[PDB]
C-alpha cells in the first residue's frame, strides 16, 4: 500500500537541510536525498525512493519527514 522506503523522519525540518539530508541517506541509503528552496511544487506525485529537503529564506529548512 506504500512504497517500501522510509516511513517518516523525526524532527529534521528546522535543523539545517544538510543535517536532514544526512539523516535521509543514513535512515534510507536506498533513497536519494535532495535539498532546495521552496519552489518545485510537490503533491500526490513524489519520489518514494527520494527524500528532498526544502528551505525557506525565512531562515529555516523544511524537509518533509514523511514519504509517499
Curated annotation (Swiss-Prot):
MF terms in GO: serine-type endopeptidase inhibitor activity
Disulfide bonds, paired cysteine numbers: 3-48
Function: Specifically inhibits both trypsin and activated Hageman factor.
Pfam families xrefs: potato_inhibit
Family: Belongs to the protease inhibitor I13 (potato type I serine protease inhibitor) family.
UniProt source species: Cucurbita maxima (Pumpkin)
Keywords in alphabetical order: Acetylation, Disulfide bond, Protease inhibitor, Serine protease inhibitor
Keyword Disulfide bond: yes
Site, as annotated: Reactive bond: 44-45
N-acetylserine, modified sites: 1
Membrane-spanning ranges: none
Protein's name in the database: Inhibitor of trypsin and hageman factor
A GO BP annotation: response to wounding
Amino acid at each position: 500500500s506504500s512504497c517500501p522506503g522510509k516511513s517518516s523522519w523525526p524532527h529534521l525540518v528546522g535543523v539545517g537541510g544538510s543535517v536532514a539530508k544526512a539523516i535521509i541517506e543514513r535512515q534510507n541509503p536506498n533513497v536519494k536525498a535532495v535539498i532546495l528552496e521552496e519552489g518545485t511544487p510537490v503533491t500526490k506525485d513524489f519520489r518514494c525512493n527520494r527524500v528532498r529537503i526544502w528551505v525557506n529564506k525565512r531562515g529555516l529548512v523544511v524537509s518533509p519527514p514523511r514519504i509517499g
